[PDB]
Amino acid sequence: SFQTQHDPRTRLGATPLPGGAGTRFRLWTSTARTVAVRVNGTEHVMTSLGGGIYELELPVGPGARYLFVLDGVPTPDPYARFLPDGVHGEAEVVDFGTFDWTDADWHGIKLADCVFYEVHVGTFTPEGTYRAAAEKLPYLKELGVTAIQVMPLAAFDGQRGWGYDGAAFYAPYAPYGRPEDLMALVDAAHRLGLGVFLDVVYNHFGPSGNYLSSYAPSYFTDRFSSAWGMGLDYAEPHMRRYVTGNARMWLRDYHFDGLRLDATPYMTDDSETHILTELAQEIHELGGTHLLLAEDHRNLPDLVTVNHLDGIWTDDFHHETRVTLTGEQEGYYAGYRGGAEALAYTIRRGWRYEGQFWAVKGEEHERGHPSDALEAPNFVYCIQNHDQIGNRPLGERLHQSDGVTLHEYRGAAALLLTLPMTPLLFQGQEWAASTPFQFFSDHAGELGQAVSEGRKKEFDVPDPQAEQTFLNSKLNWAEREGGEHARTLRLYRDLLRLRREDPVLHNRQRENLTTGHDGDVLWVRTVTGAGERVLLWNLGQDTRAVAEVKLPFTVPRRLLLHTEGREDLTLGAGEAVLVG
Template sequence: MTMSPASGAHPQKTAQDAQAPRLGAHLLPGGGTCFRVWTTTTTDVAVRVNGEPHPMHPQGEGLFELVLPVGAGTRYLFLLDGVPTPDPYALFLPDGVHGEAEVVDLHAYTWQHTNWRGLPLAECVFYELHVGTFTPEGTYRAATEKLPELAALGVTAIELMPLAAFPGGRGWGYDGVAPYAPYAPYGRPEDLMALIDAAHGHGLAVFLDAVYNHFGPDGNYLSAYSPRYFTERFHTPWGAGLDYAEPHMRRLITENARMWLRDYRFDGLRLDATQEMQDDSPVHILRELADEVHALGGTHLLLAEDYRNLPELVTEYHLDGMWVDDFHHEVRVTLTGDRDGYYAAFQGGAAALANVINRGWVYEGQVWPLDEKLHGGPQRGKPADGLGAASFVYFIQNHDQVGNRAVGDRVHHLERVPLALFRGASTLLLTLPMTPLLFQGQEWAASAPFPFFSDHHGELGQLVSEGRRREFSLFEGFAGEVLDPQAETTFQLAKLNWAEREQGEHARTLALYRDLLHLRRKDPVLRHRDRSGLRAGHVGDVLWVRHVTESGERVLLWNVGREAADAQALGLPFSLPTPVLLHSEGREGMRLERGEAVLLGSDA
């Protein structure tokens, strides 16, 4: 990504830019619907409404417009040179991305929890979920019924995987092509609003994973309207780059963010792969997004998924935080011993864990030992000393790190990872002041995997299946079986089994998560979200994490070795506080078997 200046005036805007005419179909206050198109490929533009074509009137600069006496629920399709062309600005595509759009009244829903103002990042405990597999039904309505369970667990923010309309009947959502249209198989727009409204009633913020770095290969009609949406100046892993210097592309992105936050009342966005949002404009698109989102009023947050470890995304571009892969990778190597693929760049073990906790992330300018193309150059990262704890989003599972494996197995599915070791890692995650993220079902060590799945048709579907087998050839774990992403059975495997959560080891793990999240919320030291009093180190294979505030002291000990350890005989560089506040396996005393963690504390 070209990191253009993050300060200074915005690009010169024309009168047309200032008015920012909204494209697509929008209801008018006095009645009727305004249909509006921008195209550079033709001057023959019409809109087909309820099967009848209506020529649209040129407005100059490639804009075409027509007002018709129709309302919400009307079906329409644009015609370019007489060719039916779906609307990429559609607010709803009930028949899929290749079909007619529906005129939608985004203000018809009656909101119940109008006093909700959002949560600061320091109060967020994220729960990432995929609507289609979170429940057996795979709908917004079904997800709404589970909100009391999440609130009781102690999470405070749910993060929905992408909802922008994508092709087929199932998928992760990262190949979206109609960013304004919520994916129809999950439900109608008002069902999504009801989910968000109900979440706010339970004290839960709601975030959306937004993909602004590329469009999917199937159903992307933007180029039919104008090739100027894209550029050959930049390339992404998915093809030509988006041209954020083109005012219409820039408005498509910024207005889309405003719609989700303003009209659907999401509390924030997680921006997918921001390293691929390459922009040579005077003001980078990320800075403009941050400025506009933060100007909406209330608390609205922007988080970046970005592997480059660049603190300026927060300090200069004014995003609020970043997903930190380095923490996950060090935990993963510690738990599994994996050293293939990008895991070869991480050491694992107590010393490496202490380092990532102290520094925030691992790579802060060191030479990246693997393929430079993966991280943009020989050096990766910069020091993160200026970032607060809340700006680091830490996780031990997420959709990528589970799904980008041959069979989508979770780390606790591996025979070489005892559940005690997984529960110890969970204890570390939820007692650090950094912002934690859980992946659906993690809290009860779910048996369901999360493999990659899609529903592309014809040759594209075959290419996806073949590409999946090649994509992860660096990983030994992909040498055998690879689930076919196109198979319906692969999708069904990912659906959570909610009945198991109160049984056996699942129930034991769930109880630990509830206890940890209660402590995180109520404990006078753990609820402080600062790094100034946080230090980590190790004695042999035992990691220690010490957090000292004006309220007292907390010490976490986690035994990542194979031999048992006596916490009192470690020879730590400080005296252990008492009493024991929590043991990850519910044991008495301070003896730590393999994988076990203990939290001790004293108040000031």
């Protein structure tokens, strides 16, 4: 009996009318005294319906250009479906009915079947567009990933950016391509049997191009703030519907299989039904198999069990892994010892912090909750993602950090890709890419200068505003064909094939997973009705024979995969083996 709050009849923004009758324009304003739409350069006064709702139907169709005029001020449409001249410009009318989808036989992807591959459209290819990205889909299918995780596409200011400065949430960022180019990308992925997920940012708007307050200051609250402005007021139903409307667009209109909600701890809502719960209700009302994941550092199972999200990006695994390999202790890395025993524990518990004191200076509190309710697929694990690379001063990747060997990097991949938790890989990870992933932006004027200054002060640090910082983050595809890059790629392929094919590795139950250690050797054991597998990872500096590792069970004898392709059951420093 949940009824969506959304009706195409009353949708805010510009919506094509049936019967070729044109377009219905709608907006909500709490403060404007005069309200007009400017279409293709001509102003038309809009009809006042009450409740600050304004509407007008005109015989213009898809492709018409418009913005609204509030008390005589031309103002971009926050509900714009496309912004061909960027976030300060006219919107284009978009008709979602005209694209010829060929993915009728695609029915989404279950979380337990996902191996995510995180893509930044601007850097994934030289062109930095959906059309160029689509040409890499067969490579990704053959690689063995099953779901692309696309960084945010909401329009933001400037000619490149990560996506976290999105301001017009309904408008795919024009430099990447037109709406139909995005549809072509999703349709192509589906035809290859790959899922496509989108990163969406419902905790804040970027600093440039967000005009919602021009319509109604009450979209936002002074009670709390975001990084860029006033906090998003989830007590206000129009603010709720701005994001639930947006979620439904991406899923229904662009055929995304799921969404990754950025920084859910900062979606503040004291309503009876939390906005996260209402998001789940709204997307499920679509009657598909769409998934919602949360990026959430609180180690809070209620995200799944109460808000009915599907899973959670859980960084304790990533952090424990990095500290294991580097010994670093700056910032939140101080929360972790690292090492075989620490990793065994963190895997056993899903996440490490289940209520214990987090002693990180400046952040001290009792962090997290018991993980018992969560099942293996509910945890999303990685050893690399945009933040864990990009929030480093030089944006270097794990194998590029001081004191990490390629052998260790390959061992880390084996651990990640054999665990029943849902893995995520960052673009280029699979071939040990030579290129960093640095923080880049392209804001205008004083704001641009403030970002450059901000980055310098926070930590030579590459200037985020420099074109070179963007270009230095571009993938170099040719390099994967040779040397250590090719070796790493072969291993990733072998791991992903084993994940797919191995009947024991099909396990998705924490009940069947056990872990432990002998000195600096980590072991991870899976036992199902199909058999037994053990992953051993030598995190020490010396060589260890599998036969001499003390285990509370008899080690399986058959060598299924060795991270350095060795014939015998011996582990060099940093190496791993899967036995069965």
